[PDB]
Scaffold this active site. Structure first.
Site, short mmCIF file in Angstrom:
data_model
loop_
_atom_site.label_atom_id
_atom_site.label_comp_id
_atom_site.label_asym_id
_atom_site.label_seq_id
_atom_site.Cartn_x
_atom_site.Cartn_y
_atom_site.Cartn_z
N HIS D 366 -9.45 -42.15 66.40
CA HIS D 366 -10.77 -42.57 66.86
C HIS D 366 -11.62 -41.31 67.00
O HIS D 366 -12.77 -41.28 66.56
CB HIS D 366 -10.66 -43.27 68.22
CG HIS D 366 -10.48 -44.76 68.12
ND1 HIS D 366 -9.34 -45.33 67.59
CD2 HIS D 366 -11.28 -45.78 68.49
CE1 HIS D 366 -9.46 -46.65 67.64
NE2 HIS D 366 -10.63 -46.95 68.18
N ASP D 477 -17.29 -48.80 68.84
CA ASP D 477 -16.94 -47.59 68.10
C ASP D 477 -18.11 -47.09 67.26
O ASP D 477 -18.41 -45.90 67.26
CB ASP D 477 -15.72 -47.81 67.20
CG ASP D 477 -14.41 -47.70 67.95
OD1 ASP D 477 -14.30 -46.81 68.82
OD2 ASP D 477 -13.49 -48.49 67.67
N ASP D 490 -15.51 -51.14 64.14
CA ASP D 490 -14.50 -50.81 65.14
C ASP D 490 -13.27 -50.30 64.41
O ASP D 490 -12.54 -51.07 63.80
CB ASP D 490 -14.13 -52.05 65.96
CG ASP D 490 -13.18 -51.73 67.09
OD1 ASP D 490 -12.16 -51.06 66.83
OD2 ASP D 490 -13.45 -52.15 68.23
N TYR D 491 -13.06 -48.98 64.46
CA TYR D 491 -11.89 -48.41 63.80
C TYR D 491 -10.69 -48.88 64.60
O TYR D 491 -10.69 -48.79 65.83
CB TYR D 491 -11.93 -46.88 63.83
CG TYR D 491 -13.21 -46.23 63.37
CD1 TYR D 491 -14.32 -46.17 64.21
CD2 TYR D 491 -13.30 -45.61 62.12
CE1 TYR D 491 -15.48 -45.50 63.82
CE2 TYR D 491 -14.45 -44.94 61.72
CZ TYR D 491 -15.54 -44.88 62.58
OH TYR D 491 -16.66 -44.19 62.19
CA LIG Z 1 -11.48 -49.62 68.43
#
Ligand SMILES: [Ca+2]
Lengths: 98, 713, 49, 584, 547
Positions: D366, D477, D490-491
């Site tokens: 992230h 994210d 959203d990773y």
């Molecule tokens: Ca995430």
DNA sequence: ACAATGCGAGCACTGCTATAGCAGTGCTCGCATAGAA
């Protein structure tokens, strides 16, 4: 350990006032507290009294009020040396009673 | 919102009392501003592992690491298994340093014993080759770890290795960049990540990287000693605060944060005591700026004082102010933080109660301060908390006790009907006496206030005393009575680590040999090697069974490495009657230390049966209710009044008083040896000895313990 | 940044015993015994000093 | 004795399964049971299990709220406090039990296992006397108990009447430690030199007198002390009475030793108006012949309010079951979506599937995209440096530097859109939103509409949370714009699920409901909706949105599109009802 | 290094636990890495139950055996393995106190090598019960055994057990082993002139102990013995683990202590392992008589750590000439003596019983069980023949027929499955489960437990102390755990093709589990293969009996 | 499924050698052994 106890606390202070760099320390303190009242004095010890006089003994512009009662010095077992009191009794001539 | 000087030192309590009556009474709460360190297992745990290269590895310390779930799991150790390891470690002789090098590194004499490598070896050496068979490499195997349980030894032996790998890995100084992976590696090596901990662990790795990267940034050439980093990792971790729950699930307990003066309807201040609130800390002294102040400057004093003001200012409806008025010990009085003093002082100086309108400034003032000030009680169950008016507690829980509506504990001893069977293993009569009260607890109602976790010697053995020395005197004795080789025993005893170091150990042994020999010789001097005997008597409508060991044609010969005791005489007295009854006409002696002795004359199979009954009688009553009879206290009072001449039981007020001394002297021993009374079993019956139950003790213990004296020698 | 120590009562026993190990362990019997008759262990040495 | 009893109790609580330890617990004097009670309770199997249940509850109370809450819960039932208080010397026993609890409470918040506490007890019971924090608390009633204190604790203290029962003792100083009367120094004669011992013995009573002074000084109206013709010397009463060797004796016998009667005469000597003696007149009368009275007219306020509603600030946590306790606290941005261990999936050819699993490494990933230059190429040094600092092994740079790019130049939905085409101005990383939520959000009520509009949420297990009023935290994210619309990225670093085959449009939409991420969608978008509507003065959903992208980082190759990535576009009619679902 | 890395990694890859690698390091470590690995594997096999480690399974054979044939240190075949080990003093022939002994070409953990010797010492010290007077004995025997016309083997079992201090009786489930011990002691009581004859029954398990009495009481009640028919067996059920008091752990007994009895009778002996025995034997008053009972061919007598297997091996040797004559003297029947080798005290106090005469058969479970105890051809044509329909049911399992098994499997548990559905919730569900049970050789896999549980729980969808049940994910149990347990219906599932785990004794104990129906899902290659293999046997007990 | 010392008394008894006093050998037994930043 990098720790410090109480015996050490007032011990390290006694060494400092002893060492060469003991004057900058004596004066420093002396300014902060030009007049000091020591209570329950009949229970001091050589280490204490030393630090005390090393700072205020024979010093104009300052006052050392030593108050306690030799008849009540009963903490021998913890190191309260009645003798160092009688010593201090000898050095300071101004005596007073209630 | 409830704010305190130090939210860390209030947290236990906050949690404690907010743990109350589910329904009605309950109101949610969320503590914020605590420190990461002071609120997470693993944290201080890891910081601990970062100190391996300095540790002495004391026993309790390592085992302490195991109480940390994640660390245990990482080595397949269960709460079940820990209990064994914990025992073996103690019994194998572990207590000191990990290695031998660990010891030398401490500029100490590598004894090669009591260290972990020793204790572990004795354990793995036990996994195979049993205790006997002798010492392997100057090491004596420890068999408690032999079965499949020996599998646990692998897990423990596996941990200490990891600890040692690292205790030596973290030893030398490394260039800043090299320390980067160290934190991550360790965590994977000692911790099997939970879920919560996965979080806390990530925090460790953050600070660690931070602290290092920062040092690299400023391009630091010279290498860094671990201490540097650990000590910093500690500090940071000490300052990182958790307060994510600040404004969700209501009632916020926290500290006075500068620059965060939010308005609340209710504001409570606790622990506003002198020396506690206006939080201090003196400027470095060499902080030029502090000696020559200016308008922009800032200091804690100022920040805190202006904080107390922000409270008052922000309290929209109610301001709650509390401080501690006295320490629950010396009961000396304490004082409210000057700040609080400046508040009521202002209140009193600018207010007056309706009643008092024409009396005085000072006088009207007092009544006001006194009226707002509310002196609380020491205990929550104090009735004042339950009358009507100012803060009647909302805790009914205490009400009953507040109203002295209790029902004093009812006398524990209630006779229990008992059905005297038929066939009582000799053992149950032997184990009944040698302490009957206990027998009523353990036998009649399966109550064994078992006590075991037993202190682990915070050191190697320098001296032999109490239970240990006894146990050693048992084998040394037996070995000298079997005229066997005491040298063998010695080596074995030493290889286990049970003896003091070398010269001192050789000395210890040598002097015990001397006392035990004197004893053994008294046995050998009249030991006619005989064999086992079976008991199957018929007494007043009762049977019995048992294995009376080494029964000689002379009769019975017993010996033990302890002092004389009435309890011990009784033991042999019972073992005797049964013997005399089972036929076999002979004698029976019990040789003790200090040349003590309990010798009984042959009895006619008839009278033997006659006394074997009274003992059998006590077990009966003993099973109904606590049959008194304190073999030592009673045995004492009983021995002071008895006389070998004419079987003279004295009644004169001269000894009747010396006896009462001998008794209490045994009931409550010295400052060294310590009394029969000092004993849970008796303790549960009565905490203090009443002249009443003392009588019961004599009368009763005289009724059963007398034959012992009427026949000795 | 000084940390206020608490132990000592223990730090002291440990010290008194480190003294007994490096000083008494290496002793040869003839000497060791003498010491023994003066004090039996580090525990006894402390109760005296 | 209580500490021990409590310990047995904690062992019963910690395992009411084992018939023994429990009985043992019940046997404790603290439980106030009878011998009879113990008996019957042993011969009646149903009433036994009754108790077991009872304790099994206490362990529960312990696991959930702690020890203090458990112990007090125990006492309240067995009505312990109330009974003990009524049992002579019971008040002391109670305060001590309460005390233990206050200490057992501290110790709790310093160990994560109950057993760890039990252990904690044992040791303390075995090796005590530590701090003054574990010292005994005196009772608030003692202010009405004859006080017996030491000359020392009495210095400074005042007392109406005082008694000095043993003021004659002395105990001669044998240790040759004295102060030189000339140099006033503390000298230690390591040799029992009679001269120096004589000196020390002097300083001894020199201090005894000093104590004597303090003892007599404590009384206000009167003070009576005990005197006797004491004699230590085993010298057969040769007119000895070494009484003169005591501070008080030395003052009575003006220095010189005396006859046994010689004392009696010295006392008479000075003895009028203020001084007077008597003979040690013993006596007996067991009674303190005092009676009592009492009228317990009490009761405890009972609040007539009720819990009702609960305002909290949830955050797609009404989903994820705990374990994250204190986790979302210590690390607000921890990759809470990952967790677990790794094993023999190390296959000698590093791939994105073998990258260390868990939260610690997941947040590392992230991290990378927290401030990256999607625009330009992936500098390997920056990657080598990222792993180096992150504590990983440098030998991951190739795989990683190649992994990142592959995900960058990856085609999102259709026309163009690829992270690498996004410049700073069109990117907003880690957006933190707060969606107020009034009118309780019922798990069921929401499950209905979530169904009709979403084919994914067709797998209807939902409504796994309960009513909540308040706010709705949430981090996004990434939110960007392809000059036309805004999106939600959203990773998600997850899986240990071997390789590729597990990152197919099927497998992904599976884990989706598996973790009920679907909710994250609807929620998150509902936020971006509210935000965009707020900012873009006069905005429309389908003219400004068209987003929602989920990147399961792993299983993403340079030439296997639609694998690793997942895309959805909220029904617009759902967001409509969902928005007003909040404030109606 | 030291070797450490290689070993510790072996634990990572779970190929020998920590205890093993640690034990090797602290005992060797500073010696030729060979000795180090040796100890690691020794302690390994030991963990699995093997008493010793054959130098053979350590000489070039492990290049295809224990996965640690990987080496840079393993200097060639090193041959001097005997030499290299003894060199290091963590191993000795037996003299010095050594954790590892090297007796024969076997490497033992001392504790083992001793336990073994103590065992062999017991079967080569077995003195003859002077209580001869064959005259009377023969009488008390001719009277208890009537149909002794045709060599009655149970009558010899007794005779052998009454004329020896130590004796073992090996027999299948279908033998009067239960009642043979009955008369055996019945006569023991009888020939006890005055008194002092304490008989205490036992078994390694509480389950057998259970039966012993409720059967020894049954078949003992009956027949002639009232001459105070009550100093009987205390019917007192002891775990082979109480008598010799164990306490949470050492024992109150060894060489002078408990075992207050003159005659001991352990049952289910086939479940006694090296460790237990060793102590029991010394703990036995030299004046006591032990009568072991069990089945030599039960997987339990041959599995790692067993002994009954090896002890009863020298049975096929027959009695010695003189003993064969003496027994045939006591019983009115001649007693063979096929080849006089040696084990004397052993061969002369061993005695396996056989099923007796009854027209017809023992068919189904019977025939299968017997043939399984030997040749193929036998095992083959009993299946096809007549289709014992009820008793035997061999079904071809390979390919998709696995789902065929899965059916007739839920079919078996039919009764069980219906009680649940019919909600008949009492305890008849318990007795219902012991009616049918699956048996497999492995613990994990498509076959085996863990594996069979899943694939089956899935079918009842697409259709719908110890060993004490309530799905420990049982459903399918390992032939091993099933020991000492019997079910009305039983089906066996063998691996497709492989594993040495599938030996003869395993198949045998599986079959002997069934009371009525017995389904065997296997292949005439694997079955016929198993039929030929025979659970390898570690130990030196074979040698210690040949001196 | 388990127990501190040490010191002299105290008195009993045993040689001597200018019955009594002084001494010495011995075993038994009662007595006294901290305080609270
Ligand atoms: Ca995430």
């Amino acid at each position: 350990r990098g720790e410090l106890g109480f015996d050490d606390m007032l011990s390290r202070l006694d060494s400092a006032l002893r060492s060469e760099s003991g004057e900058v320390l004596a004066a420093a303190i002396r300014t902060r507290f030009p007049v000091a009242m020591i209570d329950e004095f009949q229970d001091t010890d050589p280490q204490q009294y030393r630090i005390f006089r090393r700072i205020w003994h024979h010093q104009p512009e300052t006052a050392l009020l030593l108050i306690g009662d030799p008849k009540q010095a009963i903490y021998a077992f913890r190191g309260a040396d009645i003798f160092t009191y009688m010593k201090a009794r000898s050095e300071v001539h101004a005596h007073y009673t209630l | 919102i409830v704010m305190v000087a130090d939210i860390d030192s209030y947290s236990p309590f906050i949690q404690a009392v907010f743990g109350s009556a589910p329904a009605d009474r309950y109101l949610p709460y969320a503590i914020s501003d605590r420190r990461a360190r002071q609120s997470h297992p693993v944290l201080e745990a890891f910081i601990s592992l970062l100190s391996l290269p300095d540790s002495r590895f004391v026993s309790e310390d390592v085992l302490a690491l195991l109480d940390v779930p994640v660390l245990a799991a990482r080595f397949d150790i269960t709460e079940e298994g820990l209990r064994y390891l914990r025992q073996w470690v103690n019994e194998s002789g572990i207590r000191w340093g990990i290695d031998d090098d660990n010891v030398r590194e401490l500029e100490l004499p590598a004894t090669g014993q009591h260290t972990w490598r020793f204790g572990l070896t004795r354990m793995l050496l036990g996994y195979a080759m049993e205790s006997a068979q002798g010492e392997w490499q100057s090491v004596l195997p420890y068999d408690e770890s032999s079965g499949l349980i020996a599998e646990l030894v692998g897990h423990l032996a596996s941990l200490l290795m990891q600890l040692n790998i690292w205790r030596r890995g973290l030893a030398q100084e490394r260039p800043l960049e090299e320390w980067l992976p160290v934190c991550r590696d360790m965590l994977n090596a000692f911790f099997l990540p939970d879920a919560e901990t996965e979080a806390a662990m990530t925090l460790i790795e953050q600070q660690w990287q931070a602290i290092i990267a920062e040092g690299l940034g400023a391009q630091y050439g010279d290498a860094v000693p671990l201490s540097l980093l650990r000590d910093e990792l500690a500090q940071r971790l000490d300052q990182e605060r958790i307060s994510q729950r600040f404004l969700a699930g209501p009632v916020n307990i926290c500290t006075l944060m500068p620059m965060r003066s939010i308005p609340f309807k209710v504001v409570c201040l606790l622990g506003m005591n002198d020396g506690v609130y206006p939080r201090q800390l003196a400027p470095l002294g060499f902080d030029l700026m502090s000696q020559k102040p200016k308008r922009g400057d800032r200091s804690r004093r100022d920040d805190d004082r202006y904080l107390f003001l922000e409270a008052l200012i922000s309290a929209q409806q109610k301001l709650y102010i509390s401080y501690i008025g006295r320490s629950i010990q010396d009961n000396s009085e304490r004082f409210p933080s000057v700040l609080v003093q400046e508040l009521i002082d202002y209140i009193g100086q600018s207010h007056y109660l309706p009643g008092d309108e024409a009396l005085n400034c000072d006088e009207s003032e007092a009544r006001v301060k006194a009226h707002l000030t509310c002196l609380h009680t020491r205990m929550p169950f104090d009735p004042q908390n339950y009358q009507p008016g100012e803060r009647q507690s909302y805790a009914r829980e205490w009400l009953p006790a507040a109203s002295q509506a209790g029902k004093a504990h009812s006398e524990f001893v209630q006779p229990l009907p008992f059905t005297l069977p038929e066939t009582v293993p000799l053992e149950t009569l032997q184990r009944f006496w040698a302490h009957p009260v206990r027998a009523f607890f353990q036998m009649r109602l399966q109550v064994n206030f078992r006590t075991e976790d037993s202190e682990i010697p915070d050191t190697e053995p320098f001296i032999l005393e109490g239970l240990s020395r006894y146990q050693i005197n048992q084998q040394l004795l037996n070995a000298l009575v079997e005229q066997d080789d005491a040298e063998r025993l010695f080596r074995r005893f030493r290889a286990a680590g049970d003896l003091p170091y070398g010269a001192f150990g050789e000395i210890f042994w040598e002097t015990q040999c001397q006392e035990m020999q004197q004893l053994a010789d008294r046995v050998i001097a009249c030991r006619q090697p005989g064999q086992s005997m079976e008991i199957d008597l018929a007494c007043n409508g009762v049977q019995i069974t048992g294995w009376l060991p080494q029964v000689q044609p002379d009769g019975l010969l017993r010996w033990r490495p302890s002092l004389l005791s009435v309890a011990q005489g009784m033991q042999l007295w019972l073992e005797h009657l049964v013997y005399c009854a089972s036929g076999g006409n002979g004698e029976s002696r019990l040789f003790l230390r200090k040349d003590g002795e309990w010798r009984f004359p042959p009895l006619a199979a008839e009278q033997a049966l006659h006394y074997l009954s009274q003992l059998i009688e006590g077990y009966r009553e003993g099973m109904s209710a606590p049959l008194l009879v304190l073999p030592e206290s009673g045995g004492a009072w009983l021995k002071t009044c008895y006389d070998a001449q004419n079987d003279a039981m004295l009644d004169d007020d001269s000894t009747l008083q010396k006896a009462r001394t001998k008794f209490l002297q045994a009931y409550e021993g010295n400052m060294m040896v310590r009394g029969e009374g000092d004993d849970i079993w008796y303790q549960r019956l009565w905490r203090q000895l009443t002249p009443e139950t003392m009588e019961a003790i004599v009368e009763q213990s005289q009724r059963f313990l007398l034959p012992l004296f009427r026949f000795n020698q | 940044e000084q940390q206020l120590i608490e132990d000592e009562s223990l730090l002291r026993y440990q010290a008194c015993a480190d003294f007994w190990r490096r000083h008494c362990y290496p002793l040869p019997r003839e000497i060791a015994q003498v010491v023994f008759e003066t004090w039996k262990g580090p525990q006894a040495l402390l109760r005296d000093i | 004795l209580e500490a021990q009893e409590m310990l047995w109790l904690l062992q019963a609580v910690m395992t009411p399964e084992r018939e023994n330890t429990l009985r043992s617990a019940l046997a404790t004097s603290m439980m106030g049971l009878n011998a009879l009670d113990i008996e019957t309770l042993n011969n009646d199997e149903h009433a036994w299990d009754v108790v077991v249940e009872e304790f099994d509850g206490y362990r529960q109370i312990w696991r959930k709220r702690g020890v203090m809450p458990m112990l007090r819960a125990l006492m309240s039932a067995r009505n312990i406090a109330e009974n003990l208080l009524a049992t002579a010397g019971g008040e002391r026993r109670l305060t001590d039990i309460l005390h233990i609890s206050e200490l057992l409470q501290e110790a709790g918040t310093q160990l994560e296992s109950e057993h760890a506490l039990v252990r904690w007890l044992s040791q303390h019971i075995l090796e005590p006397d530590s701090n003054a924090s574990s010292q005994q608390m005196r009772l608030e009633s003692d202010k009405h108990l004859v006080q017996i204190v030491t000359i020392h604790k009495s210095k400074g203290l005042e007392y109406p009447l005082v008694w000095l029962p043993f003021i004659t003792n002395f105990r001669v100083q044998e240790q040759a430690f004295y102060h030189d009367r000339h140099s006033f120094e503390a000298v230690l004669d390591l040799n029992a030199a009679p001269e120096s011992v004589d000196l020390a013995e002097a300083e001894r009573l020199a201090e005894d007198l000093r104590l004597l002074y303090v003892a007599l000084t404590r009384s206000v109206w009167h003070c009576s002390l005990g005197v006797a013709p004491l004699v230590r010397r085993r010298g057969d009463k040769k007119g000895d009475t070494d009484v003169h060797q005591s501070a008080l004796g030395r003052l009575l016998q003006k220095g010189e030793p005396q006859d046994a009667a010689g004392l009696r005469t010295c006392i008479e000597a000075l003895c009028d108006d203020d001084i007077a003696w008597q003979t040690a007149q013993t006596g007996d009368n067991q009674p303190w012949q005092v009676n009592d009275v009492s009228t317990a007219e009490l009761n405890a306020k009972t609040l007539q309010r009720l819990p009702g509603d609960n305002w909290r600030v949830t955050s797609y946590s009404g989903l994820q079951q705990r374990g994250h306790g204190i986790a979302q606290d210590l690390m607000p941005r921890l990759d809470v979506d990952a967790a677990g261990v790794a094993s023999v999936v190390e296959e000698p050819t590093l791939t994105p599937h073998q990258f260390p699993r868990g939260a610690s490494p997941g947040t590392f990933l992230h991290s990378l995209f927290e401030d990256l230059d999607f625009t330009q190429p992936v500098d390997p040094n920056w990657v080598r440096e990222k792993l180096e600092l992150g504590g990983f092994e440098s030998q991951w740079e190739p795989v990683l530097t190649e992994w990142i790019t592959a995900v960058l130049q990856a085609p999102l939905n259709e026309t163009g859109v690829s992270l690498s085409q996004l410049s700073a101005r069109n990117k907003q990383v880690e957006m933190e939103f707060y969606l107020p939520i009034s009118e309780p959000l019922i798990a069921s009520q929401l499950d209905t509409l979530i169904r009709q509009f979403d084919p994914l949420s067709a797998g209807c297990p939902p409504l796994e949370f309960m009513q909540v009023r308040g706010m709705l935290k949430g981090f996004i994210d990434l939110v960007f714009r392809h000059e036309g619309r805004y999106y939600l990225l959203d990773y998600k670093s997850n899986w240990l699920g071997e390789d590729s085959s597990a990152y197919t449009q099927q497998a992904m939409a599976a884990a989706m409901q598996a973790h009920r991420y679907d909710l994250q969608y609807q929620l998150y978008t509902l936020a971006l909706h509210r935000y965009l509507r707020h900012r873009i003065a006069d905005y429309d959903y389908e003219h400004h949105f068209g987003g929602v992208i989920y990147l399961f980082l792993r299983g993403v190759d340079k030439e296997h599109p639609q694998q690793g990535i997942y895309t959805t576009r909220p029904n617009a009619g759902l967001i409509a009802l969902m928005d007003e679902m909040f404030a109606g | 290094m030291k070797l450490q890395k290689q070993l510790l990694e072996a634990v990572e890859h779970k190929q020998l636990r920590p205890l093993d690698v640690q034990f090797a390091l602290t005992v060797a470590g500073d010696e030729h890495p060979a000795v180090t690995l040796a100890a690691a594997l020794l302690s390994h096999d030991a963990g699995e139950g093997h008493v010793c480690l054959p130098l053979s399974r350590l000489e070039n054979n492990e290049a295809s055996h224990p996965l640690l044939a990987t080496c840079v240190s393993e200097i060639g075949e090193l041959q001097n393995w005997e030499e290299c080990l003894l060199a290091s003093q963590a191993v000795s022939r037996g003299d010095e106190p050594t954790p590892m002994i090297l007796c024969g070409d076997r490497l033992y953990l001392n504790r083992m090598w001793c336990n073994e010797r103590t065992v062999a010492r017991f079967f080569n010290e077995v003195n003859h019960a002077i209580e001869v007077d064959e005259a009377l004995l023969a009488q008390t025997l001719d009277k208890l055994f009537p149909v002794s016309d045709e060599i009655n083997w149970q009558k010899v079992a007794a005779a052998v057990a009454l004329t020896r201090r130590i004796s073992v009786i090996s027999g299948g489930p279908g033998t009067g082993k239960t009642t043979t011990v009955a008369k055996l002691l019945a006569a023991l009581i009888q020939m006890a002139d005055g008194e002092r004859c304490r008989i205490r029954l036992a078994a390694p398990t509480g389950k057998a102990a259970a039966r012993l009495t409720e059967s020894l009481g049954k078949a003992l009640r009956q027949l002639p013995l009232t001459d105070e028919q009550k100093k009987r067996i205390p019917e007192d059920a002891s775990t082979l683990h109480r008598l010799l008091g164990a306490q949470p752990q050492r024992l109150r007994h060894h060489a002078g202590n408990p075992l207050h009895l003159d005659v001991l009778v352990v049952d289910e002996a086939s479940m006694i392992d090296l460790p237990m025995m060793s102590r029991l034997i010394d703990a036995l008053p030299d004046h006591a008589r032990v009568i072991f009972l069990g089945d030599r061919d039960q997987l339990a007598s041959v599995e790692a750590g067993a002994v009954l297997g090896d002890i009863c091996a020298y049975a096929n040797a027959g009695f010695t000439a003189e003993r064969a004559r003496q027994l045939s003297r006591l019983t009115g029947t001649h007693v063979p003596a096929g080849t006089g080798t040696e084990a004397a005290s052993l061969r002369d106090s061993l005695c396996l019983l056989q099923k007796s005469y009854r027209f017809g058969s023992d068919s189904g479970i019977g025939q299968l069980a017997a043939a399984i105890n030997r040749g193929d051809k036998t095992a083959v044509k009993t299946v096809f023949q007549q289709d014992f329909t009820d008793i035997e049911k061999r079904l071809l399992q390979s390919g998709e027929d696995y789902i065929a098994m899965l059916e007739e499997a839920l079919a078996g548990y039919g009764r069980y499955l219906d009680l649940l559905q019919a909600r008949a919730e009492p305890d008849l569900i318990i007795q219902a489960f012991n009616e049918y049970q699956l048996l497999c050789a492995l613990r994990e896999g498509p076959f085996g437990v863990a594996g069979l549980n899943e694939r089956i729980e899935q079918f009842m969808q697409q259709k719908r102390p110890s060993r004490l049940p309530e799905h420990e994910t049982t459903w399918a149990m390992t032939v091993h755990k099933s020991q000492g347990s019997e079910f009305d219906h039983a089906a066996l599932i063998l691996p497709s093709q492989r594993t040495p785990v599938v030996t003869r004794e395993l198949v045998y104990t599986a079959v002997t589990r069934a009371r009525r129906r017995l389904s065997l899902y296997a292949d005439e290659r694997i079955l016929s293969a198993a039929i030929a293999t025979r659970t390898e046997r570690r130990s030196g007990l074979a040698a210690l009996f040949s001196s």
